[PDB]
Amino acid sequence: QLTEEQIAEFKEAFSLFDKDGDGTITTKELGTVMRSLGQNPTEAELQDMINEVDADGNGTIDFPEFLTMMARKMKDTDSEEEIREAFRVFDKDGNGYISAAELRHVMTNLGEKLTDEEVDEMIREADIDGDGQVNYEEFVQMMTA
Amino acid sequence: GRKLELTKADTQLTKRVKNAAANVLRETWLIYKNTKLVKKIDHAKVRKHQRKFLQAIHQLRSVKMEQRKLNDQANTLVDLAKTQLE
Ligand SMILES: Cc1cc(C)n(-c2nccc(Nc3ccc(Cl)cc3)n2)n1
Ligand SMILES: [Ca+2]
Ligand SMILES: [Ca+2]
């Protein structure tokens, strides 16, 4: 089931996929979107993504097939464990802590990065005890509460 | 809003499942017969069916992994669509 406001917002979402704005999502458009999210689906996987939603078998996804499909997967779940696992990547000694210095080293060099100033705001919240150490299980629990 | 929450988790793949699953049944039976229902174990026969058994089991593992991959790709697109709910 979907509400009036959700149907309207999902029309806007359909434009994130229908790149040329021709009313249909092709395997080519899904490939571009997936790669823009740092994924690399094969041709068969893109075809499978279309075929699972394509109820009339014309090779593309239209807005009703897209909407019908969103209705089936509305349920969300909390991301606490996955986020904790991402911090664990940077827990060199596997002791449940990342120092404020290591957090800066990570955040100013890896991925999209934060400025040293943004790192300061993050550490001010993360370092609850003011000991220069982040108990990341506790910090993630705080952000997902 | 949704904040940090995310979506809760083919004819060719179906054919890969049915053939691999039938072969798991085939080889489980032939290993069983050749190790427990014979007077004298023929080790060459056991090695042959162990090779066919591991290939069928591993083919089913491969399909299941591909289905998990396809499911997360679909959930990625659903998650992107759900950003418009904010
Ligand atoms: C069991 C199974 C296997 C696949 C692939 N399934 C599936 N389910 C829902 C959607 C979907 N693809 C898709 C297509 C386009 C968009 Cl924009 C978003 C999701 N695919 N389901
Ligand atoms: Ca299009
Ligand atoms: Ca269609």
CA distances from A5 to A9, A10, A74, A141, B43 (A): 6, 9, 14, 31, 68
Sign of CA dihedral A97, A100, A101, A103: positive
The residues with which A98 forms a beta bridge, in sequence order, are A134
* Resolution value (Å, 1 decimal): 1.6
Which long-range contacts does A57-65 make (Cβ < 8 Å, 24+ apart)? A59/A26, A60/A24, A60/A25, A60/A26, A61/A17, A61/A24, A61/A25, A62/A23, A62/A24, A62/A25, A63/A11, A63/A14, A63/A23
Show the tokens assigned to A24.
């249909």
Please provide the DSSP assignment of A8-45 as one string. HHHHHHHHHH-TT-SS-B-HHHHHHHHHHTT----HHH
DSSP letter (8 states) at residue A61: B
Q: What CATH number does the domain containing A68 carry?
A: 1.10.238.10
Mutate which of B6, B77, B83, B85 to disrupt the A interface (most A C-beta within 10 Å)?
B77
Domain that holds residue A29: 4-72
Report the separation in Å between the CA atom of B71 and the middle of ligand 1, taken as the mean of its atom positions.
Answer: 7
Q: Using what technique was this structure determined?
A: X-ray
Report which of B13, B22, B23 is spatially closest to residue B63, judged by C-alpha positions. B13
CB A133 within 8 A of CB A127: yes
Domains and CATH numbers, chain B: 1-86 (1.10.287.70)
SS (H, E, C) B56-86: HHHHHHHHHHHHHHHHHHHHHHHHHHHHHHC
CB A36 within 8 A of CB A51: no
The residues with which A97 forms a beta bridge, in sequence order, are A135
